Every structure is written in C-alpha cells, then in structure tokens.
C-alpha cells in the first residue's frame, strides 16, 4: 500500500496545481485535502512512510509557495488561520495549518510567539507514533529560520525571542523522543526486531531537530545549561527505552559544540550514569572525550580551560559511570583506560605524577579485577597489549618508559609468549630509538624486563643488542651490570647462554678496553682486569660447563689477546695459562682434524701474535704446538704447521729441514706445491741458506713434468713459473 498512496497524491496534486494556476485555491484546498487524506495510513513500514513523507512535502511545498507570493504584493486573503481549520481531517488541516502558520508567523510577527506556542499545542491533537513525527519533522523545516532570536533585525512589531524558539522546539523534541519510544511500542510482538531496525531508520527524524537547536548562536554557555541542556536531559531520563539513549546521547555532544561540554561533563557523566543498563555504553564514552582531545589538539581557538581539570574528574566520574554499570564485559572498562591513559598523555605530556598515577590506578584496577593469568586468546589481551605500548612508543624520552615506577608490577599477568615479545618489543623500541649512557636508575629494571623475558635467534639478537644497549661510561657499575646481566643470564639456563655469554665476554673485553684508558685518571686499573678475566674465564668456564668446544677456544684466544694487548700485571701466565688451557681443550676435547687445524692454525696466529709471550713459555708451547703438529693426522697441515713453526722461530735451516722431511714424508702433485711453499718459506726468510734455494729450485724442475696433465696442474705449472719470475728481484 506504499506506491498507490504516492500516486493518488500526484493525481490530486495535479488537480491542485491546475487549480493553483486557475486562482482556485479552495478547489485546490479541496484537491489537497483529498490528497492529504491518504497520509493517515498505518499499514506501511517506517521507510514506506518516510519516502511518502517528502512526497507530499514537495506537493504542499508548491501550495506553500502558492500562499506566500499572494500575501506579499497585496492580494492578502484575510483570516487564513482558521480558514485551513474547517474540515474534520487533521492532516489536511494541520499540514495546511503549518503552511499558513509559518506564513502567519511571517505575515504576523505580532502573532509569532503565539502561533509558535499555539500550533505545537495543536500538534498535541494527535498522539500517533508514526504520523505525528513526520508532522513534527515537517514542522521543523517550515519553522527552521522563522524561530525568534536575538539575531534578528530591528523592527518593533515582533513577538518572541530565542527562549520562545528553544522551548517550543524542545517542546517539539520532548514529544518526538517519546514518540520514538512510541515507535518501540506499536505493532504486534512479532515485528519488534522489525521495529528496532526501523527504529534506527527514523531515529534521525528527531535527529533533525537538535541540529536546528545547534544553529542558535546567541545562546551562551549558561543559556544552554539551565534550559537547553536540561531540556534535552529530561528526555534522557524519561525515554524509558534502551535503544532510545544510544543515538541521542551521542548526538548531544556530536552536534552541540565544544564549549558547551566543558564544565557540563559532571552532569552529562551523571546523565551517562542515568542511562539504561541494556545500552551499548562503549561507543559513547570513547566518542565523548573524542572532542575534548579535538578541543585540545586544535589551534587558533580557546582550547581546554585549565580550571576544569579533566584529569581529576574523568578519572573519578567515569569510574562512577562504571559504578553505575552492572553487567558488562570488562574489556569495555579498560577501553576507558585506553582513553584514561591516552588523554593524560596529551593533556599533560609534561607532568610526571599524573601519568604515573593512572597506570598505578590501573594496576589498582587489576588489583581488584579477580581475573586469570592473562593469555593471548581473549580480547582483553590485545587491548592491554595496546595499553602498555603507549608508554613505550609515545613517551618523549623512551628512557622515561624505563624511569616509570609502577611499570613492572603491571607486567606480571601476561602470557608466556606475550610477556617475552612485548619486552622484545620494548627492547627493540629502546634500541630502535637509540639511547645514550645508562645509570642505575634504569639499569636494573631493564634486567628485570628481561627477567620477564627469560622465566632464540631473537634472544641471540636482543642480548647482544642489550649490552650494546647497556654499555655506559661509568666503569664499575658497568662491571656489575656484566655481573647482574650474567647472573640474570644464568637464570635463563644453558641453551641461550651458549650464544649470549660471549658478548658479555665481548663486553668484558670492551670493558677492559674501557678500563684501559684511565691510566692518567686512576691507579687501580690493573686490578680489575684479571678479576674480570677470571669473571670472563668463569663465563668461559660456564660455557665449558655449557658443553661448547670451538667457541671458547677463541674466547680463550681473544681473551689471551685481550690479556696480551693490555699488559696489566700477571696477565701473561693467564694469557699463556688460558692459551695452554685452550690448547689443553684442543689436544683433548676437539676431535675433527679440520677444526683442529682451524684451532692449531689460528693457535699459531695467536701464538705469533703473542709476540706476546716471552720465549721461556713460548718455546714450551712452540715445542708443544710442534707436539700439536705431531698430534695432527694428515700430512700437509702438519707440514704447514712446522712451516709456520719456523715463523715461531721468528729456525732458519732447523725449521726448514724439519718441514722438508715432513713434506718428504709423502698424490704427488699435492706434495710439490708445498715444496714451492717451502721454497717461498725459504724465499721469505731469504729476503730477510743461499744455495738450498738453488738446490731446491732445480729440485722442483725434475718432479714438475712427470705427471698426467689435468685441469689443476696447469695453474700450478704456471704457479711454479711466476714464482721464479718473482725470484727476479732485479
């Protein structure tokens, strides 16, 4: 029954307009009353009446502009007030009485205040839910700008003011709100979900009106308060419907501007406390302090007045809002803490104790919240994941994240994968913004932040970042860091410490390389190193206990390097002692010959750069690496060992002879290349035994050709030759 109601309107408005052109208003008034007789239907859906609402609201708008020009130039048909009050059908009457009425406001501003007051009393003549609203909404359109105001020109024949405007439209509004509640209670009990979807359809009908209330600008901060605020608040407490308040309580703070909200939080939060229990409170209060942040953010305006300290009240009153809330999921509660943290960050970025207290209160929120150990699968996790991110990202200094007092007490409820990864997110962030020199105010807490992280390659990454993050310029507290890192890093176990202890050794290296500069400053410089070296050695011994072979060799070596490079007293036997210690692990523990090579070769590279040892323990290990040379299994490395043992005689012919015999102790191609090395070993010490060159140079020429030509001798056949071209030192 939707369509033909619109069409029969158009048939009768056709006879209306042809009577509007023929100066037959009354026949057109007869033609319109037949058309307006259609609009009384209740057999339509709330969308069907609304599309039929603007249907005649253009047709009578032809009749509306019909009566206006007639009165303007002097064709004033008098007494039009009761002229449209004849028949017994009120939608023919009142829709015509709207058009005449807003004309009789226009044509008689001496009856402006009267007819604005009178027709809304006549608008009480029908209490139907559907058809009164579309009447009352069309009222607002015809009474848009005709409402009286201080903002009106100076002609002494008008009646009414802004108060006559605001009260009458609230008298429109107070009708229209319960009419939305009268939508909730019309029809059978089978269409209530058909209602409440169509209740959300026609909810913006009354939503037109407070927009018209918002366009008033002569209303000040007080004139809104004691009338227009409470005259909106009255429908809030007296709607008696849950789906009523949801569109409306936003639309107050949505449409009425910023300066109206400032002191008036306290009753509006009491009005939020006055809401029904069944409502979605969540989308409200986030949008509530949406504008106050926007009033804080905006330039070229008033901004937040510091007298209404929003911090001291929103913490209290929106708590009292949840104190009025009875049966809510708790993720709605800390979605306010999403705001209550964040708003404190923007209003007082400077203030220490304010943002210190809210999280402390939020811990004291969770001190009462009898909840489980916070896993990942719930929705309360990801919001809490969002919460602690706002310190670590959005703090000015990210050291102030670490300077937070009650920080780590919040950190205790999390899940095993989360509590590590957020600290990993913390340890990434305190690195990714690169911080400088650190002191004991934030040293220990970070070590307690990794205490949330230990009790992987990322752990391999972050810890090597961590002492690179916890390197400082204080000498001995940084040593106690290297203690208390490792003492904490011993609490992790063994599987991660196999990677992460050598950076602490590398720290302890660089600590000694930080301790090596203060020779002008302090004379206790030598004492710390061997203490730290033993502390490194015990860290090595921890890795010895952690069943690692190839690494603590080098950590002994680079330790013996770090022993050998400093020169603090009694390092050399430790240098040699650990060299021996490592050599002992080499000759005992390490089994693979190639790594044993890679040990014993780099051992000589350490032993050459030990240029650090005196000969009285060198020549022991020079014999012992020659013993370790005999500990080797394959030939050439051992030949390469004794070749390099001649550099440990740096003997001359002694070493050469030994190497020669060893190279003679064995694929003949693989032999003779080493004789060229033996030549170049001789050549090297020749460039510092004259005919042993000339003996061996001719000696290579006879075992050079006697072989199969393959892909590998040919480069070596050249490698023989240019060596003799190198021997051209002229």
């Amino acid at each position: 029954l939707l369509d033909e109601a619109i069409q029969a309107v158009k048939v009768q408005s056709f006879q209306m307009k042809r009577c509007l052109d023929k100066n037959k208003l009354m026949d057109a008034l007869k033609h319109a009353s037949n058309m307006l007789g259609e609009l009384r239907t209740s057999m339509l859906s709330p969308k069907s009446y609304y599309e039929l609402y603007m249907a005649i609201s253009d047709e009578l708008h032809y009749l509306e502009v019909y009566l206006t020009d007639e009165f303007a130039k002097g064709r004033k048909v008098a007494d039009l007030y009761e002229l449209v009050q004849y028949a017994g059908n009120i939608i023919p009457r009142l829709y015509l009485l709207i058009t005449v009425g807003v004309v009789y406001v226009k044509s008689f501003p001496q009856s402006r205040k009267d007819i604005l007051k009178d027709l809304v009393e006549m608008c009480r003549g029908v209490q139907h839910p559907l058809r009164g609203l579309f009447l009352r909404n069309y009222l607002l359109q015809c009474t848009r700008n005709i409402l009286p105001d201080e903002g009106e020109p100076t002609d002494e024949e008008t009646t009414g003011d802004i108060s006559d405007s605001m009260d009458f439209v609230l008298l429109n509004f107070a009708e229209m709100n319960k009419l939305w509640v009268r939508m909730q209670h019309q029809g059978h009990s089978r269409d209530r979900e058909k209602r409440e979807r169509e209740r959300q359809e026609l909810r913006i009908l009354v939503g037109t009106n407070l927009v018209r209330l918002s366009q008033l600008e002569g209303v000040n901060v007080e004139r809104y308060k004691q009338i227009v605020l409470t005259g909106i608040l009255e429908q809030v407490v007296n709607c008696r419907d849950a789906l009523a308040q949801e569109y409306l309580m936003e639309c107050i703070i949505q449409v009425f501007p910023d300066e109206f909200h400032l002191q008036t939080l306290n009753p509006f939060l009491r009005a939020c406390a006055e809401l029904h229990q069944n409502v979605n409170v969540k989308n409200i209060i986030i949008a509530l302090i949406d504008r106050l942040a926007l009033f804080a953010h905006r330039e070229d305006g008033p901004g937040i007045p510091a007298e209404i300290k929003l911090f001291d009240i929103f913490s209290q009153q929106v708590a009292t809002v949840i104190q009025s809330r009875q049966d809510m999921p708790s993720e709605d509660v800390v979605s306010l803490q999403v705001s209550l943290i964040n708003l404190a960050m923007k209003c007082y970025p400077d203030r220490v104790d304010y943002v210190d207290k809210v999280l402390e209160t939020t811990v004291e929120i969770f001190n009462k919240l009898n909840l489980e150990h916070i896993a990942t699968s719930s929705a309360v996790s990801k919001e809490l994941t969002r919460l602690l991110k706002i310190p670590v990202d959005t703090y000015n200094n990210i050291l102030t994240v670490l300077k937070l007092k009650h920080f780590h007490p919040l950190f205790e409820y999390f899940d095993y994968e989360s509590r590590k990864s957020m600290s990993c997110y913390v340890l990434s962030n305190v690195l990714d913004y690169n911080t400088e020199i650190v002191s004991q105010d934030q040293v220990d807490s970070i070590m307690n932040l990794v205490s949330t992280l230990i009790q992987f390659a990322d752990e391999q990454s972050l810890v090597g970042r961590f002492i690179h993050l916890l390197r400082s310029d204080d000498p001995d507290q940084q040593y106690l860091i290297l203690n208390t890192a490792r003492k904490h890093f011993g609490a992790g176990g063994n599987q991660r410490i196999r990677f992460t202890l050598p950076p602490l050794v590398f720290a302890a290296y660089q600590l000694a390389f930080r301790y090596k500069e203060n020779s002008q400053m302090d004379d206790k410089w030598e004492k710390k190193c061997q203490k730290i070296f033993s502390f490194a050695h015990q860290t090595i011994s921890a890795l010895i206990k952690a069943e690692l072979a190839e690494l603590p060799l080098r950590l002994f070596l680079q330790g013996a390097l770090a022993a050998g490079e400093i020169g603090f007293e009694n390092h050399e036997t430790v240098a040699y002692e650990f060299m021996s210690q490592a050599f002992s692990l080499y000759e005992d523990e390490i089994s693979d010959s190639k790594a044993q090579l890679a040990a014993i070769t780099l051992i000589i590279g350490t032993f050459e750069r030990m240029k650090c040892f005196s000969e009285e323990n060198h020549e022991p290990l020079r014999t012992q690496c020659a013993l370790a040379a005999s500990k080797l299994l394959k030939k050439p490395d051992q030949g390469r060992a004794v070749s390099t043992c001649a550099h440990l005689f740096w003997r001359v012919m002694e070493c050469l002879k030994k190497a020669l015999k060893i190279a003679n102790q064995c694929d003949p191609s693989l032999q003779v290349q080493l004789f060229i090395e033996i030549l170049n070993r001789y050549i090297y010490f020749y460039e510092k035994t004259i005919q042993v060159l000339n003996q061996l140079i001719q000696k290579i020429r006879e075992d050079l050709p006697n072989l199969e030509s393959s892909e590998e001798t040919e480069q070596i056949n050249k490698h023989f030759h240019n060596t003799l071209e190198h021997l051209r030192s002229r």
């Binding site: 009050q85 017994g88 009120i90 006549m122 209490q127 139907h128």
Partner: protein, 293 residues
Amino acid sequence: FGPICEIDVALNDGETRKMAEMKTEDGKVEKHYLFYDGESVSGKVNLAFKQPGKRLEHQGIRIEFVGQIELFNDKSNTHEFVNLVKELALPGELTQSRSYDFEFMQVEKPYESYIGANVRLRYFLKVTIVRRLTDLVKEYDLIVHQLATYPDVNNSIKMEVGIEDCLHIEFEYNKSKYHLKDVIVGKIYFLLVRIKIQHMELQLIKKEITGIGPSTTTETETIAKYEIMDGAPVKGESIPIRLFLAGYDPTPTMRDVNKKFSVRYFLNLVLVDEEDRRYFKQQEIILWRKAPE
C-alpha cells in the same frame, strides 16, 4: 387567457432588510425580509392588470399578516399564532391596475421562522381578493428570527462519565447557552482505561421535538462527527478541543416554540474500540441567535 389579476406585495421598507436566509426541502433556501418582535409591517399590495376591457367582479380585498407554524403535512393542523389584517379594497369593480398600501400597529412576532424536520414556522403576507367562486391568494414569505441575548449565566457543564472498570473519563463544556457563531470549547480528563479504543469522537444532534402528549414523533439526525483523543491512552493524558459552530449554521433553541414544538441541540461522546462497541453520553447545549450588535 390565463390569470386576470396578480397580487404583488412590495414593502414600504423593502430595501433596508435582509436577515440572512435558509432554508427549505430538496436543498432549497429561503431568503426574505427579516423581521423581529415588536416591529411594524408596512407595505404596498399591487394588483397586476394584463387584459384591458374585462371588468373584475370583486367582493373584498384584504391582506392578512400571518405568523404561522406548519406541522405533519396536513392542512387542518396548521395554526397561525399572529394574524393582523389590513383591508385593501371595498366590494366593487376594477378597471386598471390598483395598489393597496398597508400599515398596521405593533406587530408582535413571538418566535423565529424556523423550518425543522417536520416543523416549518413561517411568516407571510396573505392577500385575499374575494370573488364570487374562487379567491386570489399570493404567498409572500417573510423570515423572522428570535433574538435572545448573551445570558447572565452560561455555566460550565462537567461530568466524569464512562464505563465501569473499562473507561474512566471526565468531560467538560464551558458554556451552555451558546449562540450560533460561538465556539465549542471543552476538555476531557482520563482516569482509568481497560479497553482498546482506536479513534472516535463527538456528535452534534439537532433535536427538534414534535408531537403533544402520548403521540410524539422522534427523528434521528446527526450534523457533525468530530474526533477525540484519537488513540488508547493511559493515565496522565488529556484531549484539547477547538470546534467552530460556523461550519454547520444551526438555529436557536427556543424551547417549546408556541406550545406545539421545540428544537434542541445535544452533544454525544461516542468512543470506538477495535471491536467497534459504541459507548455514549447525552448532554444538551442551548443555542440562540446572536444579533449583529
């Protein structure tokens, strides 16, 4: 040949008069000269002469002022309550056209010329040219209205009627003696509801009463069908009423107009539920003609 004489009656004051009009049967309306109580009736009765040569044997011409009422469509039940007579011509002969002026004294006109359902009250000038066999009668009707004023007392009617344990209302009417251009103002005050009223209203029934004694005829006629609270309200709601009487044009009350009939005007509150049950209450108003002051 047709008629020989026609009576034409023109008033001496046939210009400064109107007194509105209405009405008659088959939708017709009577507009005549409007008279009131105590006014004199002065005029001229003119005879129309059309055929020259014929001489008219007459034995008397007079005019009777008639104030009469008509009831039950029979000739013998007619009663002329006021009859003043002016003689016009002596028994003689007639040659040309002749006019007859007439001017009586105090013309008491006790009630309104009012035409109801079975009752017509009328005033007319009855001229009687008496001839040998049949007489000439010309009926020139004259409307007369009854003027009562704004009374000293016009009381607030009020009553809390309704249905026991189904509907409690409280009706009210501010006046009782209304005039014909008054406005009908009242209020309704709900107290209790149990039945599901849809939308219903107010009735205006004009009760003209005919018959004397045990023989009394009662006819049903309803002029208007107004509205009400237009719904099924609960406690705390009322119904504002603005009703104009000018859209119906009623006559005055004039109870027991001249010992044979009356006319009265009543209000009925009928309220209709979804099963269309009819629930009524009868209350009279009084009407009387407000004169243009």
